[PDB]
Protein backbone atom coordinates (compact mmCIF):
# COMPACT_ATOMS: atom_id res chain seq x y z
CA UNK A 1 0.00 0.00 0.00
CA UNK A 2 2.62 2.53 1.07
CA UNK A 3 6.32 2.03 1.80
CA UNK A 4 7.03 5.30 3.60
CA UNK A 5 10.52 6.09 4.87
CA UNK A 6 12.02 9.17 6.53
CA UNK A 7 15.82 9.27 6.76
CA UNK A 8 17.51 12.24 8.44
CA UNK A 9 21.19 12.24 9.38
CA UNK A 10 20.77 15.19 11.77
CA UNK A 11 17.34 16.43 12.87
CA UNK A 12 16.84 19.12 15.50
CA UNK A 13 13.22 18.06 16.04
CA UNK A 14 12.00 14.87 14.34
CA UNK A 15 8.22 14.37 14.33
CA UNK A 16 6.69 11.34 12.64
CA UNK A 17 3.10 10.07 12.66
CA UNK A 18 2.04 6.84 10.95
CA UNK A 19 -1.57 5.70 10.54
CA UNK A 20 -2.26 2.31 8.99
CA UNK A 21 -5.48 3.45 7.31
CA UNK A 22 -8.58 5.55 7.94
CA UNK A 23 -11.93 3.86 7.24
CA UNK A 24 -15.33 5.52 7.58
CA UNK A 25 -14.12 8.41 9.75
CA UNK A 26 -15.29 12.02 9.53
CA UNK A 27 -12.23 14.21 10.18
CA UNK A 28 -12.92 17.94 10.54
CA UNK A 29 -10.23 20.49 11.28
CA UNK A 30 -12.25 23.47 12.50
CA UNK A 31 -15.95 23.23 13.36
CA UNK A 32 -18.31 26.13 14.01
CA UNK A 33 -21.90 26.16 15.22
CA UNK B 1 0.89 1.78 -4.50
CA UNK B 2 3.32 4.45 -3.33
CA UNK B 3 7.02 4.17 -2.50
CA UNK B 4 7.47 7.46 -0.65
CA UNK B 5 10.87 8.44 0.72
CA UNK B 6 12.14 11.59 2.45
CA UNK B 7 15.92 11.92 2.79
CA UNK B 8 17.38 14.97 4.55
CA UNK B 9 21.02 15.18 5.60
CA UNK B 10 20.35 18.08 8.00
CA UNK B 11 16.82 19.09 9.00
CA UNK B 12 16.09 21.72 11.63
CA UNK B 13 12.53 20.45 12.06
CA UNK B 14 11.55 17.20 10.30
CA UNK B 15 7.81 16.48 10.18
CA UNK B 16 6.51 13.38 8.42
CA UNK B 17 3.01 11.89 8.33
CA UNK B 18 2.19 8.63 6.55
CA UNK B 19 -1.33 7.27 6.03
CA UNK B 20 -1.76 3.86 4.44
CA UNK B 21 -5.00 4.82 2.68
CA UNK B 22 -8.24 6.73 3.23
CA UNK B 23 -11.46 4.85 2.41
CA UNK B 24 -14.96 6.30 2.67
CA UNK B 25 -13.99 9.23 4.90
CA UNK B 26 -15.37 12.77 4.67
CA UNK B 27 -12.47 15.13 5.42
CA UNK B 28 -13.40 18.80 5.79
CA UNK B 29 -10.88 21.51 6.63
CA UNK B 30 -13.12 24.34 7.82
CA UNK B 31 -16.82 23.87 8.56
CA UNK B 32 -19.37 26.63 9.16
CA UNK B 33 -22.99 26.43 10.26
CA UNK C 1 1.98 3.71 -8.99
CA UNK C 2 4.21 6.52 -7.73
CA UNK C 3 7.90 6.46 -6.79
CA UNK C 4 8.09 9.75 -4.91
CA UNK C 5 11.38 10.94 -3.43
CA UNK C 6 12.40 14.13 -1.64
CA UNK C 7 16.14 14.70 -1.19
CA UNK C 8 17.35 17.81 0.63
CA UNK C 9 20.94 18.24 1.79
CA UNK C 10 20.03 21.07 4.19
CA UNK C 11 16.42 21.85 5.11
CA UNK C 12 15.45 24.40 7.74
CA UNK C 13 11.96 22.90 8.05
CA UNK C 14 11.24 19.62 6.24
CA UNK C 15 7.56 18.66 6.00
CA UNK C 16 6.51 15.50 4.18
CA UNK C 17 3.11 13.81 3.98
CA UNK C 18 2.55 10.51 2.16
CA UNK C 19 -0.86 8.95 1.52
CA UNK C 20 -1.04 5.53 -0.11
CA UNK C 21 -4.28 6.31 -1.96
CA UNK C 22 -7.65 8.00 -1.48
CA UNK C 23 -10.72 5.93 -2.40
CA UNK C 24 -14.30 7.16 -2.23
CA UNK C 25 -13.58 10.12 0.05
CA UNK C 26 -15.18 13.57 -0.19
CA UNK C 27 -12.46 16.09 0.66
CA UNK C 28 -13.62 19.70 1.04
CA UNK C 29 -11.30 22.55 1.97
CA UNK C 30 -13.75 25.23 3.12
CA UNK C 31 -17.43 24.52 3.76
CA UNK C 32 -20.16 27.11 4.31
CA UNK C 33 -23.79 26.67 5.31
CA UNK D 1 27.78 25.86 -2.71
CA UNK D 2 28.04 28.66 -0.15
CA UNK D 3 24.61 30.16 0.54
CA UNK D 4 23.34 32.40 3.35
CA UNK D 5 19.62 31.64 3.59
CA UNK D 6 17.16 33.27 6.00
CA UNK D 7 13.60 31.93 5.77
CA UNK D 8 10.59 32.99 7.85
CA UNK D 9 7.58 30.70 7.38
CA UNK D 10 4.35 31.50 9.22
CA UNK D 11 0.91 29.92 9.01
CA UNK D 12 1.98 27.02 6.80
CA UNK D 13 -0.83 24.50 6.27
CA UNK D 14 0.06 21.10 4.79
CA UNK D 15 -2.35 18.23 4.24
CA UNK D 16 -5.48 17.05 2.47
CA UNK D 17 -8.55 19.32 2.66
CA UNK D 18 -6.88 22.52 3.83
CA UNK D 19 -9.41 25.10 5.03
CA UNK D 20 -9.13 28.80 5.82
CA UNK D 21 -5.51 29.99 5.74
CA UNK D 22 -4.36 33.57 6.33
CA UNK D 23 -0.87 35.01 6.18
CA UNK D 24 1.00 38.33 6.36
CA UNK D 25 4.63 38.56 5.25
CA UNK D 26 7.19 41.37 5.25
CA UNK D 27 10.79 41.49 4.03
CA UNK D 28 13.38 44.18 4.70
CA UNK D 29 16.42 42.41 3.29
CA UNK D 30 19.48 44.18 1.86
CA UNK D 31 18.49 47.48 3.47
CA UNK E 1 28.18 22.32 0.83
CA UNK E 2 28.70 25.11 3.35
CA UNK E 3 25.39 26.83 4.12
CA UNK E 4 24.34 29.17 6.94
CA UNK E 5 20.58 28.65 7.30
CA UNK E 6 18.30 30.45 9.76
CA UNK E 7 14.66 29.34 9.63
CA UNK E 8 11.78 30.60 11.79
CA UNK E 9 8.62 28.50 11.43
CA UNK E 10 5.50 29.52 13.35
CA UNK E 11 1.96 28.16 13.25
CA UNK E 12 2.79 25.18 11.04
CA UNK E 13 -0.19 22.83 10.61
CA UNK E 14 0.45 19.37 9.15
CA UNK E 15 -2.15 16.65 8.69
CA UNK E 16 -5.40 15.66 7.02
CA UNK E 17 -8.32 18.11 7.27
CA UNK E 18 -6.42 21.22 8.36
CA UNK E 19 -8.74 23.96 9.61
CA UNK E 20 -8.21 27.64 10.35
CA UNK E 21 -4.53 28.60 10.15
CA UNK E 22 -3.14 32.11 10.68
CA UNK E 23 0.43 33.33 10.41
CA UNK E 24 2.50 36.52 10.50
CA UNK E 25 6.11 36.52 9.30
CA UNK E 26 8.84 39.15 9.19
CA UNK E 27 12.41 39.04 7.87
CA UNK E 28 15.17 41.57 8.45
CA UNK E 29 18.05 39.60 6.97
CA UNK E 30 21.18 41.16 5.43
CA UNK E 31 20.45 44.53 7.04
CA UNK F 1 28.63 18.90 4.34
CA UNK F 2 29.38 21.68 6.82
CA UNK F 3 26.21 23.59 7.68
CA UNK F 4 25.38 26.02 10.50
CA UNK F 5 21.61 25.72 10.97
CA UNK F 6 19.52 27.68 13.48
CA UNK F 7 15.82 26.79 13.47
CA UNK F 8 13.08 28.24 15.70
CA UNK F 9 9.79 26.33 15.45
CA UNK F 10 6.79 27.55 17.45
CA UNK F 11 3.18 26.41 17.46
CA UNK F 12 3.76 23.36 15.26
CA UNK F 13 0.64 21.20 14.94
CA UNK F 14 1.02 17.69 13.49
CA UNK F 15 -1.75 15.13 13.14
CA UNK F 16 -5.10 14.33 11.57
CA UNK F 17 -7.86 16.95 11.88
CA UNK F 18 -5.74 19.94 12.88
CA UNK F 19 -7.86 22.83 14.17
CA UNK F 20 -7.09 26.48 14.87
CA UNK F 21 -3.36 27.21 14.55
CA UNK F 22 -1.75 30.63 15.00
CA UNK F 23 1.88 31.63 14.62
CA UNK F 24 4.14 34.69 14.62
CA UNK F 25 7.70 34.46 13.32
CA UNK F 26 10.58 36.93 13.10
CA UNK F 27 14.10 36.59 11.68
CA UNK F 28 17.03 38.95 12.16
CA UNK F 29 19.74 36.80 10.61
CA UNK F 30 22.90 38.16 8.97
CA UNK F 31 22.42 41.58 10.56
Numbering used by the authors:
A (entry chain E), B (entry chain C), C (entry chain A): 43 to 75
D (entry chain B), E (entry chain D), F (entry chain F): 44 to 74
Sentences from the paper on this structure:
Numerous pathogenic D10 variants have been reported, including the first mutation to be identified, p.S59L1. To assess this, we solved the structure of S59L D10-NT fibrils to 3.06 Å resolution. As expected, residue L59 in this structure flips away from the tightly packed position of S59 in the PF interior. This results in a different PF fold and packing arrangement. Interestingly, S59L fibrils are no longer symmetric, with each PF adopting a different fold. S59L PF-A adopts a fold similar to the WT PF1, except that the beta-helix connecting strands 1 and 3 is disrupted by the flipping of residue 59.
Mitochondrial proteins CHCHD10 and CHCHD2 are mutated in rare cases of heritable FTD, ALS and PD and aggregate in tissues affected by these diseases. Structures of D10 and D2 fibrils assembled in vitro from the low complexity N-terminal domains of each protein show that their core comprises the most highly conserved region between the two proteins. For D10 and D2, the central conserved VAV motif forms a beta-strand that is associated with the protofilament interface in all the structures we have observed, suggesting that it may be a critical element in fibril formation and may be expected to appear in ex vivo structures as well.
